[PDB]
From Swiss-Prot, chains A, B, C, D, E, F:
Subcellular location, record wording: Cytoplasm; Membrane; Nucleus; Synapse
Name of the molecule in the record: Alpha-synuclein
Domain remark from Swiss-Prot or TrEMBL: The 'non A-beta component of Alzheimer disease amyloid plaque' domain (NAC domain) is involved in fibrils formation. The middle hydrophobic region forms the core of the filaments. The C-terminus may regulate aggregation and determine the diameter of the filaments.
Positions where Phosphoserine occurs in the chain: 52
Illness the protein is tied to: Genetic alterations of SNCA resulting in aberrant polymerization into fibrils, are associated with several neurodegenerative diseases (synucleinopathies). SNCA fibrillar aggregates represent the major non A-beta component of Alzheimer disease amyloid plaque, and a major component of Lewy body inclusions. They are also found within Lewy body (LB)-like intraneuronal inclusions, glial inclusions and axonal spheroids in neurodegeneration with brain iron accumulation type 1. Parkinson disease 1, autosomal dominant: A complex neurodegenerative disorder characterized by bradykinesia, resting tremor, muscular rigidity and postural instability. Additional features are characteristic postural abnormalities, dysautonomia, dystonic cramps, and dementia. The pathology of Parkinson disease involves the loss of dopaminergic neurons in the substantia nigra and the presence of Lewy bodies (intraneuronal accumulations of aggregated proteins), in surviving neurons in various areas of the brain.
Organism: Homo sapiens (Human)
Effect of residue 15 to Q: In PARK1; no effect on protein structure; no effect on phosphorylation of the protein; no effect on membrane- and lipid-binding; increases oligomerization; increases fibril formation; increases secretion of the protein; impairs copper-binding
Annotated segments matching region 4 X 11 AA tandem repeats of [EGS]-K-T-K-[EQ]-[GQ]-V-X(4): 1-32
Purpose: Neuronal protein that plays several roles in synaptic activity such as regulation of synaptic vesicle trafficking and subsequent neurotransmitter release. Participates as a monomer in synaptic vesicle exocytosis by enhancing vesicle priming, fusion and dilation of exocytotic fusion pores. Mechanistically, acts by increasing local Ca(2+) release from microdomains which is essential for the enhancement of ATP-induced exocytosis.
Residue positions binding Cu cation: 15
Length: 61, 61, 61, 61, 61, 61
């Protein structure tokens, strides 16, 4: 079906994901999967089958 | 069916996910799955089948 | 069916998820699944089948 | 001596002089002298001597 | 002496002099002298001697 | 002496003098003298001697 997105902004500002750490001993950072982060961000049908986007670290020390 | 999104903003400002830590010993940060974060953020039908987006760390020390 | 979203804002400001920690020993942060966080945030039909978005850490020490 | 004028407005709107007439036979409009009309309008020492600003029509039919 | 004018506006709008007539027979419009009309309009010492700014029509029919 | 004018506007809009007539028989329009009309309009010492700025029509029919 139809999906109409119309925007008439003026002076937009976007930040997406942001990670910060300090004085840590052991850092592990994992980002992704389906991050989109726009000014007119649009996502549709990220999975349309028996499929996975499991951005799963699995820290097993 | 129809899905109409119309916006006529002026001077919008967006922050999405934001993580901060300090003086930690062992840091583990996992982000994703279906993060979108827009000024006109739109998501639709993120899963349309027997599928998973399980952004599941599984810290097993 | 129809889903009409109309907005005529002026000077909007949005923060989404925000995590903060201090003096911790062992930090574990997991975010995602279907975070959207817009100025005109819209989600629809996040699951339309036998599927899961279980952003479930499972800290098993 | 000192004359300090400080303003920190936001969204100001000013109209100055405004004349309107209708169905008149004989119209005579005279404006001036020391009209100032600002958003931070300031006037000082408009006359500092034996001088005149007499915006005086003198309709003598 | 000192004369300090400071302004930190945002979105100002100014109209100065405005004349309107309709269905008149005989129109006479005279403007001037020391009209200033700013967003940070400032006037100072418009006359500093034996001098005149008499914007005086003198309609003598 | 000092005369300090500081402005930090954003999106200013100015109209100065504006004359309108309709269906008139005999129109006479005279403007001037010391019209200034700025966004940071400043005037100072418009007359500093035995002198005149008399923008005076003198309609003598």
């Amino acid at each position: 079906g139809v999906l109409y997105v119309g925007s008439k902004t003026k002076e937009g500002v976007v930040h997406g994901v942001a990670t910060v750490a300090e004085k840590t001993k052991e850092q592990v950072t994992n980002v992704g999967g389906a991050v989109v982060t726009g000014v007119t961000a649009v996502a549709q049908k990220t999975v349309e089958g028996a499929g996975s986007i499991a951005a799963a670290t699995g820290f097993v020390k």
